[PDB]
């Protein structure tokens, strides 16, 4: 009975991201590797630049505690183990990837640029498939 | 793989929070009620004041999706349930409350004041029981 | 139908007063005696100082007409009486004392000081009983 | 053994209103609807303008708790239920309507204007019915 | 879940229209004839004057498509037809007339004057019938 | 016939002193010893400093003549004695100590400081025993 949209300090409420297809976001491993490779200083050093990585830290932490839960259910629990593991991938997996993808993207190209791409992607997906040019991820610095 | 400390950039490394006993932290319902009663503006309005409530949002959200997972396993799954619900209460229940307790405490009394309280509590608990003053959590605005 | 909070325009929403336990508030006779002894001028003289005593007047009047109703049901009505007298004591007795207790307390010590006392009492009661300082109502002019 | 006249900060002691006939005041529903329709901002917003609505709030609240008492005696209690309900309409009903009518009227036309109308109404009712012109509610902004 | 009422840009929220009795508003035919006779260029010419006629247009269109649906159900459906038509007039017809009545009235006599007329009629109907001066719709340029 | 309050012209009406329990006041011998040890100059030298010791003189004198009456009834009178000696101890013993206790206390710590102590003690005692801090008489120069 608490309803808070994470994406309100930066605009682009949660309803905006619902347009993007579920399978459009790349896998968790690629996003984690991108965050680690591009951003090792910011995540490790205490110097504060923006709330983006400030929230990215606990995003990674909630993902990690979910991974530890998966390891626990694999090791200590009893068929019934694989099904819960599959569920968290499809249930929390979508949310975690959305959190990771938005914050990484807005750090590289800027938070303003991703806004227009989100708006344009909404227009392109609303048109019926009878006539739509092939659109791909188009972001430029 | 690799570990990062969320409590950083406010001082108060993770090692300091290990001073406090596990059972000292109050129950989740009290923290949620206090956060609601004291703050309905910051959690809902888009205005930014500090990263504290910024991280509080994802903390509440990760707790909420944990509750949703508990509801799903209650509704769909088969003696194997109550052990899972108890486990997350004793394992993630401690971890989640730590994030919530620190942030609400440092919002009212300030992030500077809570630091010496952690130091003072550490000193108080390390003394032998043969002579110790009965201590209660002393915080005044 | 619709609800309004009397404690508003002084801060101190209704949710804050839910922190205090029901039995904490002292008995009606003590509050009436304290109000009489400390204030016979404000309650009688037409001079206005603050809305506090202004609302205190109607509070006392609603309590008085409740007492008159109790006297009437004692004098005129028929085992069905004592259950009514007990019910109003346990239902309206709590509600009336809340109005009286807040107003007299914020007159002597000030409306600003009572606020942090509510916050401090909330913090004190939310901690687990395994370690808590024995607290008494600390108010000093 | 407490005697306080509510109407002393604004003048027009309780003895002044005793002149007006009991059935002159309109029904509670009409006064509540008038207060709601004309004054939704003042009753809801914390901004303070005058003690009028400041007392109107607890007037409505005491009426509401009386209504809840009526609902309780209707639902939980056992002939003996209708009679107490009828009594509160004639006993507290007159007082509540007087409180509501005075404060609503003095907000619209001003607190000074209602004073003259009360004085003149006293003169008109003191004359024996042998010769009195028909007088009606006459208030103008 | 959508909750919004039209009467905000002009003030006078929907609660104000609840004072005036339902049967007070005249029938749809008279309002339509008045709108057609007094304002034919405003409804037809694209010239902009105020949002009043701007909303009046879709008011008329929504009423007209309701009439078209009524004709469709009359011609196509099978007792069950008449009750639906009587239903829409008593349920939807009242709401439509409020839009037309407010906008037509505020164009001739002005949006300012009609506001005081609303409260004046509201308080006038609340006074007891034993004393009320004879009042009718009083609107003068 | 008619009653006057001695404690007047220093604030602290008689009603305030009714807050303190009867047995709280210490025994007469301790008060006399404290008055002697702290003040031998004021009680003997003719110099005037305040009405406090001025009234203290007649207080001690009325107590002394009561003691003389006790000695006389012991020496001259006849089971009827000890009931009289006990009665004056329980009836005038309370009254005399009140005069002495107030005056010596307000001489050392000052008449201004003792006022809030009476208020603070009243607040402390009115709270229910379910939660109260153990209070001792806190007075510091």
Author numbering:
A (entry chain A), B (entry chain B), C (entry chain B), D (entry chain A), E (entry chain D), F (entry chain B): 49 to 126, 278 to 340
Give the original sentences from the paper that presented this experimental model.
The N-terminal domain of HBcAg (aa 1–149) can form a dimer and be assembled into a capsid with an icosahedral symmetry composed of 180 (T = 3 state) or 240 (T = 4 state) subunits. HAF is composed of HBcAg, along with histidine and tyrosine tags for binding to gold ions, as well as a tandem repeat of the affibody for binding to EGFR. In the HAF sequence, the affibody was inserted between α4 and α5 of the HBcAg, the spike tip of the HBcAg. The affibody used in this study specifically binds to the extracellular domain of EGFR with a dissociation constant (KD) of 5.4 nM.
HAF was expressed in E. coli and self-assembled into a spherical capsid form. The purified HAF preferred the T = 4 symmetry. A Fourier shell correlation (FSC) of 0.143 was chosen as the cutoff for resolution determination, and the final resolutions of HAF (T = 4 state) and HAF (T = 3 state) were 3.86 Å and 3.60 Å, respectively. The four subunits forming the asymmetric unit of HAF (T = 4 state) are colored in red, blue, green, and yellow. The density map of the affibody was not clearly visible since the connected linkers induced flexibility of the affibody, causing the structures of HAF to appear very similar to those of the HBcAg. Each linker composed of 10 or more residues made the affibody flexible, and thus the structure of the affibody in HAF could not be clearly confirmed even though the molecular structure of HAF was obtained. As a result, it was confirmed that HAF, in which the affibody was inserted by manipulating the spike tip, has a similar overall structure to that of HBcAg. The overall structure of HAF was not significantly different from that of HBcAg, except in having the affibody on the spike.
